[PDB]
Amino acid sequence: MALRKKNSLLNMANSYVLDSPQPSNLNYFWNFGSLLALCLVIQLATGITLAMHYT
Amino acid sequence: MALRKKNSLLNMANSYVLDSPQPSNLNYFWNFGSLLALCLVIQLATGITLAMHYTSHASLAFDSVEHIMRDVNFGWFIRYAHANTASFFFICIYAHMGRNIYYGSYKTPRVLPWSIGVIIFLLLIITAFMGYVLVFGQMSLWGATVICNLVSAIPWLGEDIVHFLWGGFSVGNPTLQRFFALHYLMPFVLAVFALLHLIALHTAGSSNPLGITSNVDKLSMHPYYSFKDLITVFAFLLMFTLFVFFSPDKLGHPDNYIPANPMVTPASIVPEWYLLPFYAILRAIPDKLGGVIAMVAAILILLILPIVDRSIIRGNAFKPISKLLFGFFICNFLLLGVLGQVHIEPPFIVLGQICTIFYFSYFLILLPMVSTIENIFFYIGSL
Amino acid sequence: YVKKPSYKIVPHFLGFNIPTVSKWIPIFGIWGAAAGIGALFLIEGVPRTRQDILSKIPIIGEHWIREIPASDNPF
Amino acid sequence: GKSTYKIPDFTPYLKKDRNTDANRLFSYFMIGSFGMLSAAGAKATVQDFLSNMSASADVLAMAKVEVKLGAIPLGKNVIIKWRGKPIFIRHRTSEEIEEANEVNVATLRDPQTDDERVQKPEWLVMIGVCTHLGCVPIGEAGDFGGWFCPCHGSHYDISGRIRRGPAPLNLEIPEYDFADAETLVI
Amino acid sequence: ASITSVVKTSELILKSPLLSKIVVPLAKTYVKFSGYRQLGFKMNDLIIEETPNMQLALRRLPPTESYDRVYRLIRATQFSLSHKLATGNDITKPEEDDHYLIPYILDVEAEAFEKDALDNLEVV
Amino acid sequence: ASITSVVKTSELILKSPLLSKIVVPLAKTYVKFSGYRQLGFKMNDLIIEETPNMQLALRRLPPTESYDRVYRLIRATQFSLSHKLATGNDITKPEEDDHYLIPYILDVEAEAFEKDALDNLEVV
Amino acid sequence: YMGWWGHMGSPPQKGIAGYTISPFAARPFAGVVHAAIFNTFRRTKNQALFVILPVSFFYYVWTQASEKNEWLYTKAGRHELAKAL
Amino acid sequence: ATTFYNVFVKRNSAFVATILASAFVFDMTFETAIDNFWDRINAGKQWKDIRHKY
Ligand code: HEM
Ligand code: HEM
Ligand code: HEM
Ligand SMILES: CCCCCC[C@H]1C(=O)O[C@H](C)[C@H](NC(=O)c2cccc(NC=O)c2O)C(=O)O[C@@H](C)[C@@H]1OC(=O)CC(C)C
Ligand SMILES: CCCCCC[C@H]1C(=O)O[C@H](C)[C@H](NC(=O)c2cccc(NC=O)c2O)C(=O)O[C@@H](C)[C@@H]1OC(=O)CC(C)C
Ligand SMILES: CCCCCCCCCCCCO[C@@H]1O[C@H](CO)[C@@H](O[C@H]2O[C@H](CO)[C@@H](O)[C@H](O)[C@H]2O)[C@H](O)[C@H]1O
Ligand SMILES: CCCCCCCCCCCCO[C@@H]1O[C@H](CO)[C@@H](O[C@H]2O[C@H](CO)[C@@H](O)[C@H](O)[C@H]2O)[C@H](O)[C@H]1O
Ligand SMILES: O=C1C(O)=C([C@H]2CC[C@@H](c3ccc(Cl)cc3)CC2)C(=O)c2ccccc21
Ligand code: FES
């Protein structure tokens, strides 16, 4: 059995970002979820950075 | 089927805090995990609260901490609770790592939670330190200088990294504001890792003090360990109360109530009680890079316990020789702690070096040897 | 006639043997180059990296020899 | 419609040269170009973004600190701030200079003679930050009676050379010039 | 470490007259002080079982021996949590401390190590 | 809303001459514009099936009907992701748009609603 | 390696009958006096040497070192301190 | 062409090394190319263009 399935931690990642079974016909409006994830990552990176400079 | 099992979200909570099958014989040393959880919750509550009152600017930081002590309602409590819980966090985490080393929790199949744990231990050190610096008292500023200069050990790029981490030529305002940002952040990262090491542990389940399988006899996490964990919650809060309300400064260094003066460092430099063991290690080694490597290695070397323990038996309950070796190792780690706070003078310079060698020889020599010999003694001794 | 099959066990460790590892030696080489190229690329901005590494490269090295005229430099 | 061995018509999509190396290579050129722009983009993003943590423009502001010397008595060390780092200025006595000139240079982590360090034997000027991890050594203390870093117990000399303890280098000497004989700039 | 390692090394010791003369008494005392018999364990109950090899060895135990092992572990877990020791018949007497598992794990590991060896064979 | 509700209400409309005269033509154009037939679906393919009741109804479908439903959904999913419409024989003709599922779900729900009713009966 | 309720991964159990009584039916502190005195003495005695030996040794070592250090920084210890440095 | 595939693409180690070395080259040349282009479209505007007066 594949490591990605065997190892408990990897298996959780696997279940979300790799093996996760998705419908085959999602259109471009299903992309906002990951854009919101990207916004959230940008906001954390820039935000924590501004917090290093902001008083 | 019960809602707690049906609903995906509840089912995750259920699997951790309610139905989680635990061995039936965990003793009180299994309670540190939940105390560290409680410390982490106290630290988040008091920490976020102090962040509502604290000003990260170097011109105001020390004064904002005085304002917290003096003007904010219950500010004294929140500040001392935060500071003291940082000490209790380390008592509990050394206790928890102690428990794990004594009962062989690092052995298969729990090497992963152990190894994630070693990273939590490093993150706690960096979190607690970054938090120490925010007061911007004398010790704070000097501590910042030293920790940010440990990267100078790294050759060539080292000196430039130092300047980059200070955002200046010295520890100053820039540094203090970035330490505030990261000290706020680091605990959430630490809570992620704390959660991850539990998720890694959930494959094998907790070890137990006998080191045998518990698959034969499991108890639900609640009510048994929930109520067991309350005893230590209240015992912890009793100790917390004695420090926070009655002696809030016993665990502190006076020098941190002097504002940071970059022109002098106090003649008596002694870091937090919990960093003392590694500080003595750093003092012991007379080389820059050497001293730093040894100090970091003193934590990273825990990662090799899974390899160097050659025992066929999990943990020390049944191994008289290993228990004695563990006793000497623990006492040596306390001796290092003590030597961390004496003056750098004879004869403690040589003593600190001997204790440093003994610390490392436990992982590299003694544990592999003793564990090998006890394997043989079990087999021969029981024939 | 053959009485016994003729073989040895090659030394092995953690399921690696020297035959197998020797086939991967080139690949570690390339990955080491990739790590070298990549690491050096990451720190190309670091002034020390230009000063001590990149400006020393023949022909190409002049890319990293840039002086700000002292007329435009407050520091 | 019925036979499963009659593969549906794929001719509108099938490449004639599908098994050539040229065919694979083209697709990998696209994937590799995308990796190349991602790598150029990543590096540029990380470089520009992390540079925020490097000293800001307001911090990068140079001192040129001038100090008098008439004030300073014999056998004393001052501390002048310069770029936030302290500068130890010691007005060394004749016998102090002698003591410094004694140690065989051979046995010195960082081998230097006082002559190399000072440009004027009566003015030891050093960046008073300990070369180990960066505390400021307490002067007059030590074991080589110069300076002792209290942080990890490294002893500096009257030249400010390291003699005992973890510090690897001797106390750095700034760029200092005697404009007058009674004032130096750093 | 593997049980095979431990067993072969023990056999080297029991062969050498000098070695056995000095080691066998040490090991017997060690086992008395170990005190696993005071929770009614056999030595073999304490071997780490969360391993592919050991799980396979334990599946090979005769039903009788397997059921008794479960009982001794349950009983010992109960002593542990009560902070009591075994008394009377629950204490493992030296004559009852049989290596019931060692033969099974040695067979499991013998095959596993042969498998590793033969995976690395070189036709000559 | 329940399929039972929809079906009973529809029957009230078809009963009333006036109502049917004005509603049936509307509903037929609505269905034309709905355009599910252009992906080769029968109306019933579009009923939400992630409920207990509907899962039970779908399990009750005859194997043929069930296999054909799977095919129409696979085929429609493929049209959807390609952004194509059905052509030719794949388009659902009005005569093929049979309520294959409605009888099964109405039986499932009939029992479920009777069960709810009888759970609340009062002996008089 | 550990399952969950119902499939915990115990080797098959047979022949163990387990009995307990209700918490309400039991005295939770039955024999607490006996345990607190005799049982704790038993458990303490059995573990005593594992604590006493390293504590006493490292306390001796610390004591010797702290006494030497104290003595080196007296007037009497001038010469021995000069040699140490 | 097979040869080019075999050398630079077949081994992922080699392909990633090639991509990172290409990124290096691209990064250096793109910087230089945009610098020159930016100076040509904003000619006589920028400080470097009026600096000579002072
Ligand atoms: C969802 C995540 C976030 C959102 C939606 C968000 C939104 C915003 C917005 C709208 C502002 C006002 C910006 C402006 O007009 O200047 C701002 C400022 C700020 N944010 Fe965030 N933010 C997020 C995450 C964070 C995080 C994680 C931090 C970490 C500290 C942070 C730190 C800051 C700081 C310091 C400022 C003030 C400095 C400034 O205005 O730029 N933010 N944020
Ligand atoms: C924020 C800090 C930490 C928290 C909150 C935490 C919490 C816990 C909890 C709740 C458990 C399960 C119950 C218990 O055994 O006590 C546990 C188990 C464990 N923890 Fe930690 N832990 C932390 C830090 C560490 C560290 C630093 C290590 C290792 C260096 C570690 C290693 C382990 C291991 C190996 C286990 C499995 C032990 C076993 O049950 O046998 N943890 N931890
Ligand atoms: C593991 C979690 C944490 C640890 C171990 C920790 C540790 C510390 C320590 C040792 C100090 C020095 C306290 C003193 O002597 O005054 C401190 C200060 C501080 N911590 Fe934390 N902290 C934690 C979490 C947090 C969090 C989540 C925040 C959220 C902002 C926070 C905010 C602060 C602030 C604002 C200060 C400076 C004010 C002060 O000194 O009291 N801390 N922390
Ligand atoms: C790394 C381990 C932690 C697991 C969480 C990580 C992220 C994760 O799950 O990623 C997935 C890629 C997920 N997208 C989808 O499910 C997805 C499903 C169907 C279609 C598309 N797109 C269509 O064209 C999708 O994109 C996604 O964007 O969700 C982020 C929000 C997640 O982050 C978090 O929640 C944590 C935090 C950063 C918000
Ligand atoms: C609310 C659901 C969210 C799941 C995570 C919350 C916490 C959670 O799982 O709690 C459990 C109660 C857990 N204790 C145990 O496993 C446990 C197991 C065996 C014995 C005992 N005690 C013995 O006598 C135990 O105490 C615990 O304290 O671990 C915290 C650290 C967890 O926090 C996190 O990881 C997230 C973050 C707050 C650190
Ligand atoms: C960015 C910070 C977030 C960190 C948390 C990291 C992981 C994200 C969510 C993990 C929490 C829930 O993830 C948990 O994992 C299991 C096991 O993989 C998943 O289980 C899923 O995959 C497994 C096997 O791949 C299937 O048997 C199962 O039907 C499916 O639900 C569930 O989705 C969820 O119960
Ligand atoms: C793990 C990653 C490895 C470490 C990452 C390195 C972080 C810091 C490295 C470089 C940051 C400072 O390095 C410096 O970057 C800035 C851009 O940010 C460059 O600056 C150059 O480009 C910018 C715009 O791009 C102009 O405003 C500037 O006038 C010009 O000189 C410098 O030429 C480079 O010397
Ligand atoms: O000289 C030191 C010093 O060495 C540490 C030390 C001790 C613990 C170290 C450490 C221990 C473990 C890890 Cl994983 C990383 C750092 C960090 C630096 C300090 O905390 C300190 C604080 C205030 C003034 C001086 C000092
Ligand atoms: S800091 Fe100067 S001695 Fe280490």
Residue spans of the domains in chain F: they are: 1-124
Binding site as annotated, residues of D for [2Fe-2S] cluster: 130, 132-135, 149, 152
β-partners of residue A40 are none
- SS3 at position G62: helix
Burial class (CB in 10 A: 0-12, 13-18, 19+), F4: middle
- Pick from B21, B334, B343: which is nearest to G8 by CB? B21
- Identify the helix (H) or strand (E) that includes residue F105: helix F102-118
Chains in contact with A via at least 3 Cβ–Cβ pairs below 8 Å:
B, D, F
Tell me: is residue B197 an annotated ligand-binding position. Answer: yes
Tell me: is residue B57 an annotated ligand-binding position. Answer: no
β-partners of residue B220 are B21
Chains in contact with D via at least 3 Cβ–Cβ pairs below 8 Å:
A, B, C, H
Contact status of D53 with chain A (Cβ, < 8 Å): yes
Contacts of H23 in chain C (CB under 8 A): 41
- φ/ψ of B354, rounded to 5, equals -65, -45
Which ligand does the CA of C38 lie closest to? 7
Q: In what order do the strands lie in the sheet with D85-91?
A: D76-82, D85-91, D124-127
| Contact assessment for residue B341 and residue B284, using Cβ atoms and an 8 Å cutoff | no
Give F65's contacts (C-beta < 8 A, 6+ positions apart): F100
Q: Which H, E and C letters describe D129-180, residue by residue?
A: CCCCCCCCCEECCCCCCCEEECCCCEEECCCCCEEECCCCCCCCCCCCEECC
Contacts of B112 in chain A (CB under 8 A): 7-9
Active site residue B228: yes
| Contact assessment for residue H34 and residue H41, using Cβ atoms and an 8 Å cutoff | no
CA angle centred on D78, ends D72 and D80, rounded to 5° = 115
DSSP for F17-28 reads HHHHHHHHHHHH
Alpha helices in B167-275 (DSSP H): 173-201, 226-241
For residue B6, give the nearest of A6, F47, F52 by alpha carbon.
Answer: F52
Contact status of C52 with chain B (Cβ, < 8 Å): yes
Give C48's contacts (C-beta < 8 A, 6+ positions apart): B156, B157, B160
- SS3 at position F1: coil
CA F86 from chain center: how many Å? 20
CA dist., res. B342 & res. B279, Å (int): 11
Tell me: is residue B183 an annotated ligand-binding position. Answer: yes
Contact status of G15 with chain E (Cβ, < 8 Å): yes
- SS3 at position B293: helix
Task: Give nearest CA residue, ligand 3 atom 25.
Answer: B47
Find out whether the peptide bond into B347 is cis, omega within 30 degrees of 0. yes
CB atoms within 10 A of CB F79: 19
Chains in contact with G via at least 3 Cβ–Cβ pairs below 8 Å:
B, E
Interface size between B and D, measured as CB pairs under 8 A: 93
| Contact assessment for residue D131 and residue D118, using Cβ atoms and an 8 Å cutoff | no
Place of tokens 């299903």: A30
Contact status of D57 with chain A (Cβ, < 8 Å): no
Strand D138-139 versus strand D154-156 pairing type: unpaired
Buried b (16+ CB within 10 A) or exposed e, F14-44: eeeeeeeeeeeeeeeeeeeeeeebbbbbbbb
- φ/ψ of G72, rounded to 5, equals -70, -25
Q: Which atom of ligand 3 is nearest to the CA of B89?
A: 5
- Identify the helix (H) or strand (E) that includes residue A3: helix A3-6
Q: Which H, E and C letters describe chain E, residue by residue?
A: CCHHHHHHHHHHHHHCHHHHHHHHHHHHHHHHHHCHHHHCCCHHHHECCCCHHHHHHHHCCCHHHHHHHHHHHHHHHHHHHHCCCCCHHHCCCHHHCCCCCHHHHHHHHHHHHHHHHHCCEEEC
Active site residue B15: no
Give D123's contacts (C-beta < 8 A, 6+ positions apart): D69, D89, D90, D91, D92, D178, D184
| Contact assessment for residue E30 and residue E36, using Cβ atoms and an 8 Å cutoff | no
Interface size between A and F, measured as CB pairs under 8 A: 9
| Contact assessment for residue D146 and residue D160, using Cβ atoms and an 8 Å cutoff | yes
Contact status of B293 with chain G (Cβ, < 8 Å): no
Active site residue B374: no
| Contact assessment for residue H16 and residue C33, using Cβ atoms and an 8 Å cutoff | no
Place of tokens 């400010």: D160
Place of tokens 């330190």: B129
For residue H5, give the nearest of D28, D3, B203 by alpha carbon.
Answer: D28
Task: Give nearest CA residue, ligand 1 atom 33.
Answer: A47
For chain H, the first-to-last Cα distance in angstroms comes to 57
β-partners of residue B218 are B23
Nearest CA in chain D to C38: D39
For residue D160, give the nearest of D186, D175, D109 by alpha carbon.
Answer: D109
Question: What are the tokens at F93?
Answer: 């003709």
CA dist., res. D62 & res. D83, Å (int): 7
Using CA atoms of C9, C15, C21, C24 in order, give the dihedral in degrees to the nearest 10: 140
Question: What are the tokens at B177?
Answer: 């504001």
Method: cryo-EM
Alpha helices in chain H (DSSP H): 2-8, 12-41, 47-50
| Contact assessment for residue B379 and residue E2, using Cβ atoms and an 8 Å cutoff | no
CB atoms within 10 A of CB A18: 10
Question: What are the tokens at G71?
Answer: 């003595």
Question: What are the tokens at B294?
Answer: 């040894």
Question: What are the tokens at B175?
Answer: 């540094």
| Contact assessment for residue H15 and residue D32, using Cβ atoms and an 8 Å cutoff | yes
CA D77 from chain center: how many Å? 25
Q: Which atom of ligand 3 is nearest to the CA of B87?
A: 10
Contact E27 B381 (CB under 8 A): yes
Task: Give nearest CA residue, ligand 6 atom 22.
Answer: A15
| Contact assessment for residue B114 and residue B105, using Cβ atoms and an 8 Å cutoff | yes
Burial class (CB in 10 A: 0-12, 13-18, 19+), B77: middle
CA dist., res. B344 & res. G84, Å (int): 12
DSSP for B112-171 reads HHHHHHHHHHHHHHHHHHHHHHHT-BHHHHHHHHHHTTSGGGSTTTHHHHHHHHHTSSSS
CA dist., res. B194 & res. B188, Å (int): 10
CA A40 from chain center: how many Å? 10
For residue D87, give the nearest of D124, D125, D120 by alpha carbon.
Answer: D125
Give B68's contacts (C-beta < 8 A, 6+ positions apart): B50, B53, B54, B75, B76, B78, B79
User: Is the distance from the beta carbon of residue A44 to the nearest atom of ligand 4 less than 6 Å?
Assistant: no
**G73 backbone φψ class: left, alpha, beta (φ>0; ψ -120 to 50):** alpha
| Contact assessment for residue H50 and residue H40, using Cβ atoms and an 8 Å cutoff | no
Which ligand does the CA of F81 lie closest to? 4
DSSP B264: -
- φ/ψ of D76, rounded to 5, equals -135, 155
CB atoms within 10 A of CB H21: 19
β-partners of residue D66 are D185
Nearest CA in chain E to B320: E34
Contacts of C47 in chain D (CB under 8 A): none
Burial class (CB in 10 A: 0-12, 13-18, 19+), D180: exposed
CA dist., res. B245 & res. A33, Å (int): 49
Buried b (16+ CB within 10 A) or exposed e, B88-105: bbbbbbbbbbbbbbbbbb
Using CA atoms of C8, C13, C15, C18 in order, give the dihedral in degrees to the nearest 10: -60
Strand D76-82 versus strand D177-178 pairing type: unpaired
CA dist., res. E75 & res. E69, Å (int): 10
CA dist., res. D131 & res. F72, Å (int): 77
Place of tokens 């959230």: A40
| Contact assessment for residue B135 and residue B254, using Cβ atoms and an 8 Å cutoff | no
Interface residues from chain D to C (CB-CB < 8 Å):
39, 43, 46-47, 51, 60-62
β-partners of residue F50 are none
Buried b (16+ CB within 10 A) or exposed e, B207-224: bbbbbbbbbbbbbebeee
| Contact assessment for residue D128 and residue D85, using Cβ atoms and an 8 Å cutoff | yes
Type of residue found at E89 = N
Å from F78 to nearest chain A CA? 7
Positive or negative: CA dihedral B42, B48, B50, B55: positive
Task: Give nearest CA residue, ligand 7 atom 27.
Answer: D48
For residue B180, give the nearest of A50, G6, E52 by alpha carbon.
Answer: A50
Contact E66 G16 (CB under 8 A): no
For residue H19, give the nearest of C43, D43, C45 by alpha carbon.
Answer: D43
CA dist., res. C31 & res. H20, Å (int): 11
Q: Which H, E and C letters describe B37-61, residue by residue?
A: HHHHHHHHHHHHHHHCCCCCCCCCH
Type of residue found at D157 = D
Interface size between E and G, measured as CB pairs under 8 A: 30
Type of residue found at E109 = E
DSSP A29: G
CA dist., res. E107 & res. E113, Å (int): 10
- φ/ψ of D88, rounded to 5, equals -85, 125
Please identify every residue of D annotated as catalytic.
152
Contact B208 E24 (CB under 8 A): no
| Contact assessment for residue D160 and residue D170, using Cβ atoms and an 8 Å cutoff | yes
CB atoms within 10 A of CB B71: 10
CA dist., res. B291 & res. B268, Å (int): 20
Nearest CA in chain B to D109: B287
For residue D128, give the nearest of D95, D83, D92 by alpha carbon.
Answer: D83
CA dist., res. B149 & res. B134, Å (int): 17
CA dist., res. D170 & res. C64, Å (int): 32
Residues followed by a gap in chain E, C→N > 2.5 Å: none
Active site residue B255: no
Give H35's contacts (C-beta < 8 A, 6+ positions apart): none
Q: Can you state the angle between helices B288-300 and B348-361, rounded to 10 degrees?
A: 40
CA dist., res. C18 & res. B180, Å (int): 51
Q: How far is CA B89 from CA B41, B50, B79, B82, F13, in A?
A: 11, 18, 15, 10, 72
Contact E50 G46 (CB under 8 A): no
Contact status of A43 with chain D (Cβ, < 8 Å): no
CA dist., res. D177 & res. D174, Å (int): 10
Nearest CA in chain A to B193: A9
Question: What are the tokens at D100?
Answer: 């410094």
Question: What are the tokens at F50?
Answer: 């992630």
* B43 alpha carbon – ligand 3 mean position (Å): 7
Which ligand does the CA of D142 lie closest to? 9
- SS3 at position B192: helix
Residue of B10, B15, B17 with the most ligand 5 atoms within 8 Å of its CB, for mutation: B17
Rounded CA Rg of chain B: 22
CA B344 from chain center: how many Å? 25
CA dist., res. B171 & res. D55, Å (int): 11
Burial class (CB in 10 A: 0-12, 13-18, 19+), C64: middle
Residue of B183, B243, B273 with the most ligand 3 atoms within 8 Å of its CB, for mutation: B183
Strand D76-82 versus strand D66-68 pairing type: unpaired
For residue G85, give the nearest of D109, D143, D108 by alpha carbon.
Answer: D143
Give F56's contacts (C-beta < 8 A, 6+ positions apart): F108
- SS3 at position D80: strand
The single residue of B105, B207, B214, B228 carrying the catalytic annotation is: B228
CA dist., res. D3 & res. C73, Å (int): 79
Taken as a whole, chain A contains a residue count of: 55
Question: What are the tokens at E73?
Answer: 């572990």
Using CA atoms of B139, B140, B142, B144 in order, give the dihedral in degrees to the nearest 10: 150
Question: What are the tokens at D117?
Answer: 């360090």
- Identify the helix (H) or strand (E) that includes residue D125: strand D124-127
Question: What are the tokens at D109?
Answer: 């982590």
For residue B127, give the nearest of B230, B260, B272 by alpha carbon.
Answer: B272
Long-range contacts of B159-164 (CB under 8 A, 24+ apart): B160/C46, B160/C47, B160/C48, B163/D54, B163/D55, B164/D53, B164/D54
Positive or negative: CA dihedral B319, B320, B321, B324: positive
| Contact assessment for residue B285 and residue B108, using Cβ atoms and an 8 Å cutoff | no
Q: In chain B, where are the structural domains located?
A: 1-383
For residue D130, give the nearest of B366, H28, B265, B158 by alpha carbon.
Answer: B265
* A47 alpha carbon – ligand 1 mean position (Å): 5
Place of tokens 């290579």: D25
CB atoms within 10 A of CB B331: 22
CA dist., res. H6 & res. H1, Å (int): 8
Question: What are the tokens at B4?
Answer: 């707690």
For an interface test with A, give the residue of D45, D52, D58 to mutate (most A CBs within 10 A): D52
